[PDB]
Enzyme design. Structure first.
Site, short mmCIF file in Angstrom:
data_model
loop_
_atom_site.label_atom_id
_atom_site.label_comp_id
_atom_site.label_asym_id
_atom_site.label_seq_id
_atom_site.Cartn_x
_atom_site.Cartn_y
_atom_site.Cartn_z
N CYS A 43 4.13 1.58 9.34
CA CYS A 43 3.95 0.40 8.50
C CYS A 43 5.28 -0.07 7.91
O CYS A 43 6.20 0.72 7.66
CB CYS A 43 2.97 0.68 7.37
N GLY A 71 3.08 6.12 9.85
CA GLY A 71 4.41 5.95 9.34
C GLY A 71 5.12 4.72 9.85
O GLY A 71 6.26 4.47 9.44
N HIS A 75 0.81 -1.21 0.00
CA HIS A 75 0.00 0.00 0.00
C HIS A 75 0.84 1.26 0.00
O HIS A 75 0.29 2.37 -0.08
CB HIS A 75 -1.01 -0.03 1.15
#
Ligand SMILES: *[C@@H](O)[C@H](C[C@@H]1CCNC1=O)NC(=O)[C@H](CC(C)C)NC(=O)OCc1cccc(F)c1
Lengths: 297, 299
Positions: free
Chosen positions: B143, B141, B39
């Site tokens: 991920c 942030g 993503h």
């Protein structure tokens, strides 16, 4: 939720130190290795060691230092209080920017537990007000260090030396001075009565609010002195106005004034949790500082 | 006992940042491959329900900014494996540890290295809940942060972080891109099933209390695994698997208390309660210490 600093910069400093039949860990910064001095003791010595005496009888070559597969040549040794400083010929390239600091009780630090110079785990601890720490240290963990990390700089604040009969632990700063009334001899030692780190319980209560948990709040309020009266009654540390200032950011973020939270904490102390829990615990947690909670929220 | 994480230095040396446009998250750099959540290729207009295959066809190697620190790592290839992106880079990570990719079971624990913009922030110990979520500490942030266990010199990577759910818990994938649990990488409302208590870990904890001399709760009786499981489900405990029984072996051997005897002792605690009594200094049964964790800290 309980969070330690990344330990990589410290792992690259850990070495193994042996003298006789005693093996423990050392910290290798530049061309010096730091470790607990009781490594020079034998069984007989450890009961009442005359360390200056035992040390002068020691030769550079009685110290086997191993960094992994490698052995480092000891070219000099000296003693600073309860820490032995071993100069070696080669410098640690992995040495980070660092400083040596003596933390105050109530402050937290990460511990890198090591055995035979090999990292095994990392966890967060707080310097208790009676100057012990509630660690997870076994035989061979001596020389493991505690630290904080600010920007690119590692502040070393702790080096591990012993376990008390109650299961808590004790140690020194990197200058070799103990936290607390303890001594590096093989005796059963008892600490002063421990108290709870109030400003940290408060930071943690705010943390529970931030995470959507607020069943312990109340409309009541209190003065600082009247809160401290109750706190001292239940063996909590008194709250200073610096402590209140420090809780400021957390006050702001939640819209709950420090003394409101003190009032909530006072009800908890006199009543209890009555089955309920907070952030999963059935007991009031006091090893999260205000800064800890902030950095993680 | 406290939550104890593995030292993170071997994973620190593998963390990088991956950026598409203004979207920056973390990646895992091993040999000449960077692994990250797919993503990263999503805009905001796209996150509600992305078409990942069509979003990727439009992407080229030179749209991917990978950095170790401020140093750029040139991307020379890219593919998508389930929900993770594999970016081939022109440099083999010199700090690549011995490693493997493992998919863990509910109940197992692991350390998470919480990173932002490729910089390690902190390390902590998580348990995979039986509803396939973790009770993490992740901000925006975060991920691409990973969860791992270390065995000898070998890092086993088991988790990569992708999202947070309505209830504040977190969900992610293995390093092959397959989500744990029923979740998908879309900015949509998703609820986890009802959480249950991790029985195997409660049992490990009882063994731990016996090892430390706290054994008031042992009884003279035993039970079948099926009878224990049916009663366990009525108290919102996980049923035991044969693997759970097997990983309790060492603690059973250490204490001389058969697994099913310890199950009968737990069954009685569930039916009668503590009666005002504590275990390891606690009236709550702890369920986030595995039998491997109990050993790490006892022996
Ligand atoms: C490291 O060398 C080692 C680690 C300790 C022991 C097991 N858990 C730990 O944290 N330190 C020591 O063994 C230390 C050495 C002396 C010379 C300072 N002594 C110690 O930990 O035991 C203290 C003790 C307890 C009860 C009774 C008694 F006489 C002494």
């Amino acid at each position: 939720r309980k969070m330690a600093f990344p330990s990589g910069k410290v792992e690259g400093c850990m070495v193994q130190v042996t003298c006789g039949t005693t093996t423990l860990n050392g910290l290798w910064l530049d061309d010096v290795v730091y470790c607990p001095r009781h490594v020079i003791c034998t069984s007989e010595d450890m009961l009442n060691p005359n360390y200056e005496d035992l040390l002068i009888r020691k030769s550079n070559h009685n110290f086997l230092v191993q960094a992994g597969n490698v052995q480092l040549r000891v070219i000099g040794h000296s003693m600073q209080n309860c820490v032995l400083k071993l100069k070696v010929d080669t410098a640690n390239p992995k040495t980070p920017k660092y400083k040596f600091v003596r933390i105050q009780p109530g402050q937290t630090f990460s511990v890198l537990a090591c055995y035979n110079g090999s990292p095994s785990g990392v966890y967060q601890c707080a310097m208790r007000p009676n100057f012990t720490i509630k660690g997870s240290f076994l035989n061979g963990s001596c020389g493991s260090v505690g630290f904080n990390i600010d920007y690119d700089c590692v502040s070393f604040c702790y080096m591990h030396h012993m376990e008390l009969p109650t299961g808590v632990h004790a140690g020194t700063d990197l200058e070799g001075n103990f936290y607390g009334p303890f001594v590096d001899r093989q005796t059963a030692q008892a600490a002063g009565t421990d108290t709870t780190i109030t400003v940290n319980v408060l930071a943690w209560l705010y943390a529970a609010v931030i995470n959507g948990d607020r069943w312990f709040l109340n409309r009541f309020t209190t003065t600082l002195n009247d809160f401290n009266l109750v706190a001292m009654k239940y063996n909590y540390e008194p709250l200073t106005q610096d402590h209140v200032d420090i809780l400021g950011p957390l006050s702001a973020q939640t819209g709950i004034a420090v003394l409101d939270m003190c009032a909530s904490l006072k009800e908890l102390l006199q009543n209890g949790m009555n089955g309920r829990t907070i952030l999963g615990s059935a007991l009031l947690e006091d090893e999260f500082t205000p800064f800890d909670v902030v950095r993680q929220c």
